[PDB]
Write a protein that binds this ligand. Structure first.
Ligand SMILES: COc1cc(-c2ccc3c(c2)Nc2ccccc2NC3=O)ccc1C(=O)O
Length: 266
């Protein structure tokens, strides 16, 4: 069928480190896709994306190399970013945050299962489809931590300071999985309190020192109910070896708490 391969660029969805992301509409079918234009880091992003197939991970349709500009065709999420569902200093209703946290855990369990660590989990990288289904986005910082069933320790410092785990700032080497678990706990905090707990998880940071002293009577913790706050007490643990794993998050009381729910009468 002619012109099925032609796409029109209608709107700017985002700006990457070395390029832009545009919403592309098919000329014949009017199907919407997101096109990432990038001029060892993009080669890794295409490669890691070629491995991914999960309902909570942004789908990779393919790539086209036209000289210097690399075109990445990705699943378009019409609901935008999770970041824009978080009301500043309020957050969002607890049943919505729980549903988004379930979908985030399903995505992260998947990624860790195939030996991939995202390394930059934050609400800007969590996209929502038309039914408000959460999708993990941007594999530009992602890496393989398990290959041929052998785990490799990470040492590269990356991500976003308010979301990074404290071992990333204190240790030369660290396990990849607890680092993503910690960033999920900061996302959960932002969803329930509408604010970030600290600038970075360091002893020089007063807000972080207050958390280690269990001063939950202060912000953001005073805004969070006791059941989700008990879960955050298990995630935001400084020692990554003592930090809760995802199989144990799936057994938490708040995680399994029932919270979220066309008809005519007579
Ligand atoms: C894949 O990487 C990115 C992806 C995006 C991106 C892609 C698709 C969407 C989106 C952002 N944001 C968005 C914002 C408003 C409304 C709709 C969307 N939909 C997207 O699917 C932006 C930046 C990067 C980056 O490289 O930093």
């Amino acid at each position: 069928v002619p012109f099925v391969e032609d796409w029109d660029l209608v709107q700017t969805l985002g700006e990457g480190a070395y390029g832009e992301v545009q919403l592309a509409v098919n000329r014949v079918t009017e199907e919407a896709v997101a096109v990432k234009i990038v001029d060892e880091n993009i080669k890794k992003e295409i490669c890691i994306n070629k491995m991914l197939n999960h309902e909570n991970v942004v789908k990779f349709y393919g790539h086209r190399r036209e000289g210097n500009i690399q075109y990445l065709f990705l699943e378009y999420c019409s609901g935008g970013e999770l970041f824009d569902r978080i009301e500043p200093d309020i957050g969002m209703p607890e049943p919505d945050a729980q549903r988004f946290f379930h979908q985030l855990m399903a995505g992260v369990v998947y990624l860790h299962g195939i030996g991939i660590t995202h390394r930059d989990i934050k609400p800007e990288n969590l996209l929502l489809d038309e039914r408000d289904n959460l999708k993990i986005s941007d594999f530009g910082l992602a890496t393989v931590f398990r290959y041929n069933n052998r785990e490799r320790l990470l040492n590269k410092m990356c991500g976003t300071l308010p979301y990074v785990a404290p071992e990333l700032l204190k240790r030369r080497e660290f396990h990849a999985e607890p680092v993503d678990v910690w960033s999920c706990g900061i996302v959960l905090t932002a969803m329930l309190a509408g604010e970030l707990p600290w600038d970075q998880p360091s002893d020089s940071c007063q807000e972080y020192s207050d958390w280690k002293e269990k001063k939950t009577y202060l912000n953001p913790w005073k805004k969070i109910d006791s059941a989700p706050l008990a879960l955050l007490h298990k995630i935001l643990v400084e020692n990554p070896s003592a930090r809760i794993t995802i199989p144990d998050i799936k057994k938490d009381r708040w995680y399994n708490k029932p919270l979220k729910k066309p008809r005519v009468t007579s």
